[PDB]
Every structure is written in C-alpha cells, then in structure tokens.
Amino acid sequence: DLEGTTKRFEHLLSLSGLFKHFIESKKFRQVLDVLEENQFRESPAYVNGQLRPYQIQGVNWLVSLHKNKIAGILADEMGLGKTLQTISFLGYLRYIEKIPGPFLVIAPKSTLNNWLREINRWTPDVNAFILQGDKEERAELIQKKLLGCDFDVVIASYEIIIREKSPLKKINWEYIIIDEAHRIKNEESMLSQVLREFTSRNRLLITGTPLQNNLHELWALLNFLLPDIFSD
C-alpha cells in the first residue's frame, strides 16, 4: 500500500515534478509528512517478430512505467498497431519478468476475436480463453477455466464484464486493460462503477481520443488509473 503510494510521490517529483498543486494538497498528507524533510533498444524478439523502431520506446515506456510501478494510458492513433504494442508488454512480463497471467482483455464485442488473432501471430503458446457466447457455453467455461485458475489472458466484452462480475470479482488480478477506453468517460457509468471493485496492481487503458467532450472526462480516466493521486 503505502510503500508504493509513497514511492510514486517523489517519482512524480523526480521526472519533471512541476505539479506543485495536488501532489501536496491531495488523507495522504501525514503519509508524505514523514518524507517532507527531504533497455530493449534492439527491437527485441522475445515475442516473435521484429518491432519497427518507433514502437519499442512505447513498450519500454510501459516497461518503465511497470518498472516504476505506475499505470499509464497510451494514445497511439488508429491503425498504428496498438494491438502488437499491447501484447508485447504482456510478453515482457511472461518472459523477462516471468509473471504469466492472469489478465483481462476487456474490449468491444466487435474486436473480441480480433486480438486473439493478433495475439498468436507474435506470441504463440499463450493462455487465451475468451469468455463469450450464450448463457450456457459461457457458464460451464467459468468452472473449468475461469474457476480453474489456469489462464493468463482472459478476453471478455464490455457487456460480459457487467454480467460475469461475480466470478471475476473473486479472482485477484495483476493488470486489467480496456481497448477504446473512452466509453469510460462518465465516471458514474455502470461499467465504470463496476470496475472500481476489481482488484489489480495497475491498469492499462488504450485510446486515441482521450479528450472528446470536456477536460472533466480526462480526470475520470485519471480517477481510474490512479484514484489516490487525483481523487477529485
């Protein structure tokens, strides 16, 4: 809790810590009152295939954010290969960090199967167990796989996560990802409301249009990744 909570603070102050408004105003005041006195440049191929030069630093940015243990949103534009740049990071955890699964692949219904198609083409031998279908084929799939604790990559749609919450609510998670995250722009939206209760270390959000309506929507995205940091 506080070991990461404190460490993130001066790390924000470390890399251009020019905030000086909410880093100190934020009940974390007494927590920081204690301290108030004071890399894959080779297009690596652990995941199969070659990575074009401008795609790597994004992964290292994810790696650096992971190595610093803070969540981050990427804002690659449409058609730029966010799919590859997403699964590559998970390969980093599986290969370099040796932490395979569990993770979610919360995505639109249209792209449910699409990522799995792209998942295998750069990283075969993966545990992708998409949860989709009628009331039945989903149901028995819960016990054998979701309740079997034998997965690393879980694919489920916006509508699914609001249905199969009770299984996934029990399961602890490391990371949770949402593609085309802008549907989380109303912080009282029931899907956004449900995701508050999902236990995870950090979260990843993929978007191309973070700011669409106001600047108030950005904080709702920020309230999701780092609720402690912004919280208002």
Partner DNA sequence: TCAGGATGTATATATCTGACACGTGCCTGGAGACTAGGGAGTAATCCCCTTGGCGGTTAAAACGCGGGGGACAGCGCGTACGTGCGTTTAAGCGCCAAGGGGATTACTCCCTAGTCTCCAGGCACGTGTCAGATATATACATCCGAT
- Residues belonging to the binding site are 76-83
160-189 residues in contact with Mg ion (CB under 5 A) are 179
What's the first-to-final CA gap in the chain, in angstroms?
Answer: 20
Count CA atoms closer than 13 A to 150's CA, side-chain side: 6
Question: Minimum distance from CB of 166 to DNA (Å)?
Answer: 6
* By the rule CB under 7 A, 48 interacts with DNA: no
Partner in contact with 189, chosen from DNA, Mg ion, ligand ADP, none, beta carbon below 5 to 8 Å by kind: DNA
Question: Minimum distance from CB of 41 to Mg ion (Å)?
Answer: 27
Cα–Cα distance for residue pair 204/188, rounded to 1 Å: 20
Question: Minimum distance from CB of 208 to DNA (Å)?
Answer: 14
**How distant, in Å, are the alpha carbons of 45, 111, 138, 144, 231 from that of 141?**
33, 20, 5, 6, 37
Backbone torsions φ then ψ of 46, nearest 5 degrees: -60, -45
Which residues sit opposite 106 in a β-bridge? 178
Q: What is the CA radius of gyration of the chain?
A: 18
Q: Are 224 and 195 in contact (CB under 8 A)?
A: yes
* Nearer CB in complex with ligand ADP: 4/81: 81
* Nearer CB in complex with ligand ADP: 104/229: 104
Contacts with 102 (C-beta within 8 Å, 6 or more apart), sequence order? 151, 152, 154, 171, 172, 173, 174
Cα–Cα distance for residue pair 215/138, rounded to 1 Å: 38
- Among residues 83, 88, 192, 223, the one that binds DNA under rule CB under 7 A: 192
| DSSP one-letter code for 77 | P
* By the rule CB under 7 A, 162 interacts with DNA: yes
* Nearer CB in complex with DNA: 51/221: 221
* Nearer CB in complex with ligand ADP: 56/141: 56
Note the residues at the interface with ligand ADP (CB under 6 A): 51-52, 55, 78-84, 111, 118
Question: Minimum distance from CB of 117 to ligand ADP (Å)?
Answer: 8
Backbone torsions φ then ψ of 65, nearest 5 degrees: -60, -40
Q: Tell me the window of 52-60, 83-91, 138-146, 163-171 that interacts with DNA (CB under 7 A).
A: 163-171
Partner in contact with 79, chosen from ligand ADP, Mg ion, DNA, none, beta carbon below 5 to 8 Å by kind: ligand ADP
| Residues making contact with DNA (CB under 7 A) | 162, 165-166, 169-170, 183, 185-186, 189-192, 212-213
| Residues making contact with Mg ion (CB under 5 A) | 179
